[PDB]
Amino acid sequence: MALMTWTAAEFGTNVGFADDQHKTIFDMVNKLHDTAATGNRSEIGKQLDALIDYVVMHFKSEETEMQKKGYADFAAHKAEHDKLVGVCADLQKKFHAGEAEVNQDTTRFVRDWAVNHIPKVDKLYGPCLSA
Ligand SMILES: [Fe+3]
Ligand SMILES: [Fe+3]
Ligand code: NA
């Protein structure tokens, strides 16, 4: 049972690149979720690291477009990104020190974050970025 399922109704932004990057995030989170129910710590870490790298790139992609187009709520939206990047960096620090584990609570938090962020934050840039 996949943790996350993308639909257009719930998550579509009317912005092609963003919808595509979102669908990749959901697939990479789903993979990490399944791995996080095991004790395969090396595989957990590789999938965690891949997912974080991709998310940071997604945020940059959204920010570069918002800023270039003079989107009204760019700085607020970047602030929400930058707080999750700080949480991700802190988790990588603790995980790669052997001080914290990644488990299905970790991936449920990323789920919770995304399923709030996409509809309530990302969908707001649609009109600007699809114009
Ligand atoms: Fe997004
Ligand atoms: Fe965003
Ligand atoms: Na995300």
UniProtKB/Swiss-Prot annotation:
Annotated positions binding Fe cation 1: H22, H58, E62, D122
SUPFAM superfamilies: Hemerythrin-like (SSF47188)
InterPro entries listed in its UniProt record: Haemerythrin_Fe_BS (IPR016131), Hemerythrin (IPR050669), Hemerythrin-like (IPR012312), Hemerythrin-like_sf (IPR035938), Hemerythrin_metal-bd (IPR012827)
UniProt entry keywords in alphabetical sequence: Iron, Metal-binding, Oxygen transport, Transport
PROSITE patterns according to UniProt: HEMERYTHRINS
Molecular functions (GO terms): metal ion binding; oxygen carrier activity
Pfam families linked: Hemerythrin
Binding site for Fe cation 2: E62, H77, H81, H117, D122
UniProt key word Iron: yes
Family listed: Belongs to the hemerythrin family.
Subunit description: Monomer.
Function statement: Oxygen-binding protein. May be involved in a storage mechanism or for delivery to oxygen-requiring enzymes. The oxygen-binding site contains two iron atoms.
Stored PANTHER family: BACTERIOHEMERYTHRIN
Protein name from the UniProt record: Bacteriohemerythrin
Source species: Methylococcus capsulatus (strain ATCC 33009 / NCIMB 11132 / Bath)
Lineage, top ranks: Bacteria, Pseudomonadati, Pseudomonadota, Gammaproteobacteria, Methylococcales
